[PDB]
Amino acid sequence: DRYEDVVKAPAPAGLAGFWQTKGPQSAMMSPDAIASLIVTKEGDTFDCRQWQRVIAQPGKLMNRDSEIYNVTASLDIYPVEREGNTISYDRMTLSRVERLTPECEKAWAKARATGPV
Protein backbone atom coordinates (compact mmCIF):
# COMPACT_ATOMS: atom_id res chain seq x y z
CA ASP A 1 0.00 0.00 0.00
CA ARG A 2 1.09 3.54 -0.92
CA TYR A 3 0.14 6.69 0.95
CA GLU A 4 -1.09 8.23 -2.32
CA ASP A 5 -3.64 5.43 -2.69
CA VAL A 6 -5.06 5.70 0.83
CA VAL A 7 -8.76 6.46 0.88
CA LYS A 8 -9.12 9.67 2.91
CA ALA A 9 -12.05 9.46 5.36
CA PRO A 10 -14.13 12.55 6.14
CA ALA A 11 -13.91 13.56 9.80
CA PRO A 12 -16.75 12.10 11.87
CA ALA A 13 -18.94 14.71 13.52
CA GLY A 14 -17.11 16.46 16.35
CA LEU A 15 -13.55 15.47 15.33
CA ALA A 16 -12.70 18.26 12.88
CA GLY A 17 -10.71 20.95 14.66
CA PHE A 18 -7.47 21.84 16.34
CA TRP A 19 -6.33 19.58 19.18
CA GLN A 20 -3.42 20.33 21.55
CA THR A 21 -1.92 18.81 24.68
CA LYS A 22 -2.70 21.07 27.70
CA GLY A 23 -0.13 19.76 30.15
CA PRO A 24 2.82 17.41 30.47
CA GLN A 25 2.57 14.15 28.52
CA SER A 26 4.64 11.22 29.85
CA ALA A 27 5.13 9.95 26.27
CA MET A 28 7.03 13.09 25.30
CA MET A 29 10.62 14.13 25.78
CA SER A 30 9.92 16.61 28.60
CA PRO A 31 6.94 18.15 30.46
CA ASP A 32 6.97 21.36 28.38
CA ALA A 33 6.80 19.47 25.08
CA ILE A 34 3.53 20.09 23.16
CA ALA A 35 1.71 17.96 20.61
CA SER A 36 -1.00 19.18 18.26
CA LEU A 37 -3.27 17.54 15.71
CA ILE A 38 -5.22 19.35 12.97
CA VAL A 39 -8.18 17.47 11.50
CA THR A 40 -9.96 19.14 8.55
CA LYS A 41 -13.57 18.34 7.68
CA GLU A 42 -12.36 16.44 4.59
CA GLY A 43 -10.03 14.26 6.68
CA ASP A 44 -6.64 15.85 6.04
CA THR A 45 -4.51 15.94 9.16
CA PHE A 46 -1.36 17.51 10.56
CA ASP A 47 0.59 16.08 13.50
CA CYS A 48 2.92 18.75 14.97
CA ARG A 49 5.04 18.15 18.04
CA GLN A 50 7.49 20.59 19.56
CA TRP A 51 9.97 21.11 22.32
CA GLN A 52 13.59 21.98 21.47
CA ARG A 53 12.71 21.23 17.84
CA VAL A 54 9.51 20.87 15.82
CA ILE A 55 8.52 17.70 14.01
CA ALA A 56 5.43 18.00 11.86
CA GLN A 57 3.81 15.53 9.44
CA PRO A 58 0.78 15.75 7.19
CA GLY A 59 -1.59 12.75 7.14
CA LYS A 60 -5.05 11.47 6.30
CA LEU A 61 -7.86 9.91 8.30
CA MET A 62 -8.71 6.31 7.42
CA ASN A 63 -11.72 4.29 8.46
CA ARG A 64 -10.84 0.62 9.09
CA ASP A 65 -13.54 -1.64 10.54
CA SER A 66 -15.56 1.39 11.71
CA GLU A 67 -12.62 2.80 13.74
CA ILE A 68 -10.80 6.04 12.90
CA TYR A 69 -7.03 6.24 12.36
CA ASN A 70 -4.58 8.93 11.37
CA VAL A 71 -2.26 7.69 8.58
CA THR A 72 0.78 9.96 8.20
CA ALA A 73 2.61 10.60 4.94
CA SER A 74 5.32 8.18 6.24
CA LEU A 75 2.61 5.53 6.87
CA ASP A 76 2.55 5.68 10.66
CA ILE A 77 -0.98 4.53 11.67
CA TYR A 78 -2.51 5.85 14.88
CA PRO A 79 -5.98 5.21 16.28
CA VAL A 80 -7.87 8.37 17.25
CA GLU A 81 -10.57 8.15 19.92
CA ARG A 82 -12.65 11.14 20.91
CA GLU A 83 -14.59 11.91 24.08
CA GLY A 84 -16.12 15.35 23.92
CA ASN A 85 -13.35 17.98 23.95
CA THR A 86 -10.51 15.48 24.32
CA ILE A 87 -8.91 12.93 22.06
CA SER A 88 -6.66 9.96 22.76
CA TYR A 89 -3.90 10.00 20.16
CA ASP A 90 -0.54 8.19 20.06
CA ARG A 91 -0.42 7.66 23.84
CA MET A 92 -1.30 11.28 24.62
CA THR A 93 -4.38 13.30 25.52
CA LEU A 94 -5.16 16.36 23.41
CA SER A 95 -7.82 19.00 24.06
CA ARG A 96 -9.88 20.99 21.59
CA VAL A 97 -8.46 24.50 21.03
CA GLU A 98 -9.42 27.49 18.81
CA ARG A 99 -5.82 28.26 17.83
CA LEU A 100 -2.57 26.33 17.60
CA THR A 101 0.96 27.47 18.41
CA PRO A 102 2.42 29.85 15.85
CA GLU A 103 4.96 27.35 14.73
CA CYS A 104 2.26 24.66 14.08
CA GLU A 105 0.16 27.27 12.25
CA LYS A 106 3.13 28.28 10.07
CA ALA A 107 4.21 24.71 9.32
CA TRP A 108 0.61 23.81 8.36
CA ALA A 109 0.21 26.79 6.04
CA LYS A 110 3.54 25.89 4.39
CA ALA A 111 2.61 22.25 3.88
CA ARG A 112 -0.82 23.14 2.55
CA ALA A 113 0.65 25.57 -0.01
CA THR A 114 1.96 22.65 -2.10
CA GLY A 115 -1.33 20.72 -1.92
CA PRO A 116 -4.52 21.36 -3.89
CA VAL A 117 -6.64 24.54 -3.65
PDB file of C-alpha atoms in Angstrom:
ATOM      1  CA  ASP A   1       0.000   0.000   0.000  1.00  0.00           C
ATOM      2  CA  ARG A   2       1.095   3.538  -0.922  1.00  0.00           C
ATOM      3  CA  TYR A   3       0.137   6.689   0.954  1.00  0.00           C
ATOM      4  CA  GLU A   4      -1.094   8.228  -2.317  1.00  0.00           C
ATOM      5  CA  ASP A   5      -3.635   5.428  -2.688  1.00  0.00           C
ATOM      6  CA  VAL A   6      -5.063   5.705   0.829  1.00  0.00           C
ATOM      7  CA  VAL A   7      -8.761   6.465   0.884  1.00  0.00           C
ATOM      8  CA  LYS A   8      -9.122   9.673   2.913  1.00  0.00           C
ATOM      9  CA  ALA A   9     -12.050   9.460   5.356  1.00  0.00           C
ATOM     10  CA  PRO A  10     -14.128  12.554   6.142  1.00  0.00           C
ATOM     11  CA  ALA A  11     -13.913  13.558   9.797  1.00  0.00           C
ATOM     12  CA  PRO A  12     -16.753  12.099  11.868  1.00  0.00           C
ATOM     13  CA  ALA A  13     -18.943  14.705  13.515  1.00  0.00           C
ATOM     14  CA  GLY A  14     -17.113  16.460  16.350  1.00  0.00           C
ATOM     15  CA  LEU A  15     -13.555  15.465  15.331  1.00  0.00           C
ATOM     16  CA  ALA A  16     -12.701  18.257  12.883  1.00  0.00           C
ATOM     17  CA  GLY A  17     -10.713  20.954  14.657  1.00  0.00           C
ATOM     18  CA  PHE A  18      -7.475  21.839  16.337  1.00  0.00           C
ATOM     19  CA  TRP A  19      -6.326  19.583  19.182  1.00  0.00           C
ATOM     20  CA  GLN A  20      -3.420  20.332  21.553  1.00  0.00           C
ATOM     21  CA  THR A  21      -1.916  18.808  24.680  1.00  0.00           C
ATOM     22  CA  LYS A  22      -2.696  21.066  27.695  1.00  0.00           C
ATOM     23  CA  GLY A  23      -0.127  19.765  30.146  1.00  0.00           C
ATOM     24  CA  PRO A  24       2.816  17.409  30.470  1.00  0.00           C
ATOM     25  CA  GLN A  25       2.574  14.151  28.523  1.00  0.00           C
ATOM     26  CA  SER A  26       4.636  11.223  29.847  1.00  0.00           C
ATOM     27  CA  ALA A  27       5.133   9.950  26.268  1.00  0.00           C
ATOM     28  CA  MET A  28       7.029  13.089  25.302  1.00  0.00           C
ATOM     29  CA  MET A  29      10.616  14.134  25.777  1.00  0.00           C
ATOM     30  CA  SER A  30       9.923  16.606  28.596  1.00  0.00           C
ATOM     31  CA  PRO A  31       6.941  18.149  30.461  1.00  0.00           C
ATOM     32  CA  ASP A  32       6.968  21.358  28.379  1.00  0.00           C
ATOM     33  CA  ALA A  33       6.795  19.475  25.075  1.00  0.00           C
ATOM     34  CA  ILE A  34       3.535  20.088  23.163  1.00  0.00           C
ATOM     35  CA  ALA A  35       1.706  17.958  20.605  1.00  0.00           C
ATOM     36  CA  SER A  36      -0.997  19.181  18.262  1.00  0.00           C
ATOM     37  CA  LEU A  37      -3.271  17.540  15.707  1.00  0.00           C
ATOM     38  CA  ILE A  38      -5.217  19.351  12.968  1.00  0.00           C
ATOM     39  CA  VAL A  39      -8.176  17.472  11.502  1.00  0.00           C
ATOM     40  CA  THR A  40      -9.960  19.136   8.552  1.00  0.00           C
ATOM     41  CA  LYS A  41     -13.568  18.338   7.684  1.00  0.00           C
ATOM     42  CA  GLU A  42     -12.358  16.439   4.587  1.00  0.00           C
ATOM     43  CA  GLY A  43     -10.025  14.259   6.684  1.00  0.00           C
ATOM     44  CA  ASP A  44      -6.641  15.854   6.035  1.00  0.00           C
ATOM     45  CA  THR A  45      -4.507  15.940   9.162  1.00  0.00           C
ATOM     46  CA  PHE A  46      -1.365  17.506  10.556  1.00  0.00           C
ATOM     47  CA  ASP A  47       0.592  16.079  13.503  1.00  0.00           C
ATOM     48  CA  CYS A  48       2.917  18.750  14.968  1.00  0.00           C
ATOM     49  CA  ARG A  49       5.040  18.154  18.043  1.00  0.00           C
ATOM     50  CA  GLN A  50       7.492  20.587  19.561  1.00  0.00           C
ATOM     51  CA  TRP A  51       9.973  21.110  22.324  1.00  0.00           C
ATOM     52  CA  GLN A  52      13.593  21.980  21.465  1.00  0.00           C
ATOM     53  CA  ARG A  53      12.709  21.231  17.840  1.00  0.00           C
ATOM     54  CA  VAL A  54       9.514  20.873  15.822  1.00  0.00           C
ATOM     55  CA  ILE A  55       8.519  17.698  14.013  1.00  0.00           C
ATOM     56  CA  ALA A  56       5.430  18.001  11.863  1.00  0.00           C
ATOM     57  CA  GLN A  57       3.809  15.528   9.445  1.00  0.00           C
ATOM     58  CA  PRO A  58       0.784  15.745   7.188  1.00  0.00           C
ATOM     59  CA  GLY A  59      -1.591  12.747   7.136  1.00  0.00           C
ATOM     60  CA  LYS A  60      -5.054  11.466   6.300  1.00  0.00           C
ATOM     61  CA  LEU A  61      -7.858   9.905   8.297  1.00  0.00           C
ATOM     62  CA  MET A  62      -8.707   6.307   7.421  1.00  0.00           C
ATOM     63  CA  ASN A  63     -11.725   4.293   8.460  1.00  0.00           C
ATOM     64  CA  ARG A  64     -10.836   0.620   9.089  1.00  0.00           C
ATOM     65  CA  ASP A  65     -13.535  -1.645  10.538  1.00  0.00           C
ATOM     66  CA  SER A  66     -15.561   1.389  11.713  1.00  0.00           C
ATOM     67  CA  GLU A  67     -12.619   2.801  13.737  1.00  0.00           C
ATOM     68  CA  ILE A  68     -10.797   6.036  12.901  1.00  0.00           C
ATOM     69  CA  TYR A  69      -7.027   6.242  12.357  1.00  0.00           C
ATOM     70  CA  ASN A  70      -4.582   8.925  11.369  1.00  0.00           C
ATOM     71  CA  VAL A  71      -2.259   7.693   8.584  1.00  0.00           C
ATOM     72  CA  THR A  72       0.782   9.956   8.204  1.00  0.00           C
ATOM     73  CA  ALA A  73       2.615  10.596   4.937  1.00  0.00           C
ATOM     74  CA  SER A  74       5.322   8.183   6.237  1.00  0.00           C
ATOM     75  CA  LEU A  75       2.613   5.526   6.866  1.00  0.00           C
ATOM     76  CA  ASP A  76       2.553   5.683  10.660  1.00  0.00           C
ATOM     77  CA  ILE A  77      -0.977   4.534  11.665  1.00  0.00           C
ATOM     78  CA  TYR A  78      -2.514   5.848  14.878  1.00  0.00           C
ATOM     79  CA  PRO A  79      -5.980   5.215  16.275  1.00  0.00           C
ATOM     80  CA  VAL A  80      -7.866   8.366  17.253  1.00  0.00           C
ATOM     81  CA  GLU A  81     -10.570   8.148  19.923  1.00  0.00           C
ATOM     82  CA  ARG A  82     -12.652  11.139  20.908  1.00  0.00           C
ATOM     83  CA  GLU A  83     -14.590  11.908  24.085  1.00  0.00           C
ATOM     84  CA  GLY A  84     -16.122  15.350  23.923  1.00  0.00           C
ATOM     85  CA  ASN A  85     -13.350  17.980  23.947  1.00  0.00           C
ATOM     86  CA  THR A  86     -10.511  15.483  24.318  1.00  0.00           C
ATOM     87  CA  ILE A  87      -8.909  12.927  22.057  1.00  0.00           C
ATOM     88  CA  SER A  88      -6.661   9.961  22.763  1.00  0.00           C
ATOM     89  CA  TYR A  89      -3.895  10.004  20.162  1.00  0.00           C
ATOM     90  CA  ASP A  90      -0.538   8.191  20.061  1.00  0.00           C
ATOM     91  CA  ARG A  91      -0.420   7.656  23.837  1.00  0.00           C
ATOM     92  CA  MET A  92      -1.305  11.282  24.620  1.00  0.00           C
ATOM     93  CA  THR A  93      -4.383  13.299  25.519  1.00  0.00           C
ATOM     94  CA  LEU A  94      -5.157  16.364  23.406  1.00  0.00           C
ATOM     95  CA  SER A  95      -7.816  18.996  24.059  1.00  0.00           C
ATOM     96  CA  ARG A  96      -9.881  20.986  21.592  1.00  0.00           C
ATOM     97  CA  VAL A  97      -8.462  24.500  21.032  1.00  0.00           C
ATOM     98  CA  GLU A  98      -9.415  27.490  18.814  1.00  0.00           C
ATOM     99  CA  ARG A  99      -5.818  28.256  17.827  1.00  0.00           C
ATOM    100  CA  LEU A 100      -2.572  26.335  17.598  1.00  0.00           C
ATOM    101  CA  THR A 101       0.962  27.466  18.415  1.00  0.00           C
ATOM    102  CA  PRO A 102       2.419  29.850  15.850  1.00  0.00           C
ATOM    103  CA  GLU A 103       4.956  27.351  14.728  1.00  0.00           C
ATOM    104  CA  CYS A 104       2.264  24.659  14.076  1.00  0.00           C
ATOM    105  CA  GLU A 105       0.164  27.274  12.248  1.00  0.00           C
ATOM    106  CA  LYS A 106       3.133  28.284  10.072  1.00  0.00           C
ATOM    107  CA  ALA A 107       4.206  24.715   9.322  1.00  0.00           C
ATOM    108  CA  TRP A 108       0.612  23.812   8.363  1.00  0.00           C
ATOM    109  CA  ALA A 109       0.208  26.792   6.040  1.00  0.00           C
ATOM    110  CA  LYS A 110       3.543  25.891   4.386  1.00  0.00           C
ATOM    111  CA  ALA A 111       2.615  22.251   3.875  1.00  0.00           C
ATOM    112  CA  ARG A 112      -0.822  23.141   2.546  1.00  0.00           C
ATOM    113  CA  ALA A 113       0.645  25.567  -0.009  1.00  0.00           C
ATOM    114  CA  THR A 114       1.961  22.654  -2.100  1.00  0.00           C
ATOM    115  CA  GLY A 115      -1.331  20.724  -1.923  1.00  0.00           C
ATOM    116  CA  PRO A 116      -4.522  21.362  -3.887  1.00  0.00           C
ATOM    117  CA  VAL A 117      -6.636  24.537  -3.654  1.00  0.00           C
TER     118      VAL A 117
END
